[PDB]
């Protein structure tokens, strides 16, 4: 019964529990703003400092986790949304890809759109090079920004979005429940074998990118997480 | 985009949005007690008054829902904990079975343990006749209390438990996340084709049940539900 | 080495280990409900039957105690929550003030807010005539509901709150650490000379009150106490 | 508010949330054995891997924390009970002192008994050189094993001890409540300004040592922590 669990309803620079990468910044109201509105191909990632052990090579066991968070995207003259946020899980040594071009890489993949991570994205800009659907979408990414599975969605400027992700180790099923501003929910689920795609010790976090013409305000308002791993 | 959603911090007799069946009763604190400690083979169920359309034959669409609630199961001498609580979905006409012997059935099945429903059960007494696990478990039931899949759990007398369940129509994956009082989480997921097990219109509720030797307190503390059906 | 220690997980009417006063009542699950929601200016106090000796005239020593208890306060239509719960220490011959008007007095002080007691209060209603902070708070009271020291606190409806108190005889220090639902802790400490504010023998207990337009559910879910006095 | 909060019912190698130093070993029963029974001047320390920020240079505010743990010491033929266990707070670069003689120092200071730390010791051997009271005892240490204050305490072999600590930042009051096997409790409280004795970011841990002739079994059974810093 090994269990990790933290909870932030706000943030503050200096908190050792959080690692900052890229153009990340903390607003005077505890909000985390992932990108820089004057930088080209701006990328900003935020990770939970302490690495979590999602699976043990000693017991074959994979941990389960229930996490939920709330983000918000808002438009800015005169750019076009850029192109979103992504909740990812990667190896502990994870760093913004070298020479990151932002954009469709969302700050976690290389140019080909590949990388070593598993995540859920809230994509707001269609990128033909990665097979993005023609509309805002939610997709489960496994080592590539070319989502293994997507679903129509719609990002509403200035609207707060509540997401609840559940990963059940028994079936190896990652489920996502998105509750939009107006009240409707958008779900999407996919079987993903963490023990076969990631190393025992990984880290959790959010990443947001941008481009030259495509730029917007990405904000992470709160985050609660709990990962329980059976040890027997 | 058809959406039904409600929130119950505390319940109260006389509220039209709720239906009462069996030995149900509302405590002076706004909690629903499902069984009666004095009756033999006691059974009580609470249903959300207004029925919910979870799928439409015209469209072929199935709705996805997000629901979370909290409960408490406290002990009493000289009785054994019986038998647990169950979150279920059934035909809008659903009524407590005729001659319901209580016990394992959980107030949703007959002596054979068969019925017309789909639900998650936080089972606390092991009923050998229903291929029950040797311990307190959580399980996914489909037209029977002889679970399709169970996972080792632990009910802690007098402990307030939190549960979150996500249903994804696209994959038809019912995922549950039990958050024990000590922080550990328990999870179980399963593929259940709702469209193929229940009518277009159904009702969501809670049922508990006791036996002769086994009896205990079942309290439903709070309930919030939201389902969305694509209408196109 | 004279020690007094009892551990209550749930309660029950009759048990001669607890004295009931006022509108107290016991829920079906062992929870104590200190007030009546129909009575105007209700008051309810629960005490530990057997009195405890906190200080000896001979040895001159003062006892030390470590107590912890979880409580809950839930809202109701359409009243203002009132007014809080107070853990207190008073003379073995203690009774509810003859003429208790309820309100902020919390069933321990008169209309002037004065009384012969010592306690830690969890006040939710600001009563300007007792010099109450503008927000919910936790204060150390000594012979008055007009706190000697207080701290901003947030009472959540339907949230189980856990409290741990430590009294150090050597320093005559009273340390309180409150743990809210969400995880955060609130703490208040204060130096209080019991040997000079109470009689050799006292009684420990819980007390809550209601008013006319102000009423709410006060619940004591559990309580455990342990005091130790040296005789050398 | 900034809150750090963990909880360990047991431990096990691998868990990235725990740092080991010295002769720490993890028993199959999930217990931690701090010293080695076959080494001379053995020393073993265990720490929460992530550094906690106990105060901020920005706001100036100091954090408050509530922690409780359980441990057990046990004799062995034919060595004398060595010589204690200590709960400490130190800078993030805290390591076992170079060439530690063990014993008297408890593994956290130099031969002179000095060091950089704030702790609570459970001293089971009298070291005249550090001014140890003649009997076993509990003390509050501030940068030296020559306690700033102490209180008589008996260490019963094989007896499980449960501790509760509550630091109130508004008074800088460290309060300890020790519950002995028999049921009696021991208290001790000392004012210690952490913002003046420690850096912004610190680590929490347990240490124990031994000598050539003095050796015993030091076990940590469980540990739960929770700190909260106001951020405004
Ligand atoms: Ca894109
Ligand atoms: Ca059963
Ligand atoms: Ca008041
Ligand atoms: Ca010593
Ligand atoms: Mn995409
Ligand atoms: Mn079962
Ligand atoms: Mn007050
Ligand atoms: Mn000492």
UniProtKB/Swiss-Prot annotation, chains A, B, C, D:
Superkingdom classification of source: Eukaryota
Keyword Manganese: yes
Cystine bridges: none
UniProt entry tagged with the keyword Secreted: no
Residues where Ca(2+) binds: 123, 125, 127, 132
Keywords: Calcium, Lectin, Manganese, Metal-binding, Signal
GO terms for MF: carbohydrate binding; metal ion binding
Positions contributing to Mn(2+) binding: 121, 123, 132, 137
Function: D-galactose specific lectin.
Subunit (UniProt): Homotetramer.
Additional facts recorded: Binds one manganese (or another transition metal) ion and one calcium ion. The metal ions are essential for the saccharide-binding and cell-agglutinating activities.
Family stated for the protein in its record: Belongs to the leguminous lectin family.
Name listed for the protein in its UniProt record: Galactose-binding lectin
């Amino acid at each position: 019964a090994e269990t990790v669990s933290f909870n932030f309803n706000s943030f503050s620079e200096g908190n050792p529990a959080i690692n900052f990468q890229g153009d990340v910044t903390v607003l005077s109201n505890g909000n985390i703003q992932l990108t820089n509105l004057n930088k080209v191909n701006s990328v900003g990632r935020v990770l939970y400092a302490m690495p979590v052990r999602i699976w043990s090579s000693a017991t074959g066991n994979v941990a389960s986790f229930l996490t939920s968070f709330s983000f918000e995207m808002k438009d800015i003259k005169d750019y076009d949304p850029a192109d979103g946020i992504i909740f990812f899980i990667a190896p502990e040594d994870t760093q913004i890809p070298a020479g990151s071009i932002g954009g469709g890489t969302l700050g976690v993949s290389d140019t080909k759109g590949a990388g070593h991570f598993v995540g859920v994205e809230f994509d707001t800009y269609s990128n033909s090079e990665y097979n993005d659907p023609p509309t805002d979408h939610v997709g489960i990414d496994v080592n590539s920004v070319d989502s293994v599975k997507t679903v129509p969605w719609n990002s509403v400027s200035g609207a707060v979005v509540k997401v609840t992700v559940i990963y059940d180790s028994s079936t190896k099923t990652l489920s996502v429940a998105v509750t939009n501003d107006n009240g409707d929910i958008t779900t999407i689920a996919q079987v993903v074998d963490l023990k076969a795609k990631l190393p025992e010790r990984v880290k959790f976090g959010f990443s947001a990118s941008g481009s030259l013409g495509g730029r917007q305000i990405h904000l992470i308002r709160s985050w609660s997480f709990t990962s329980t791993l059976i040890t027997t």
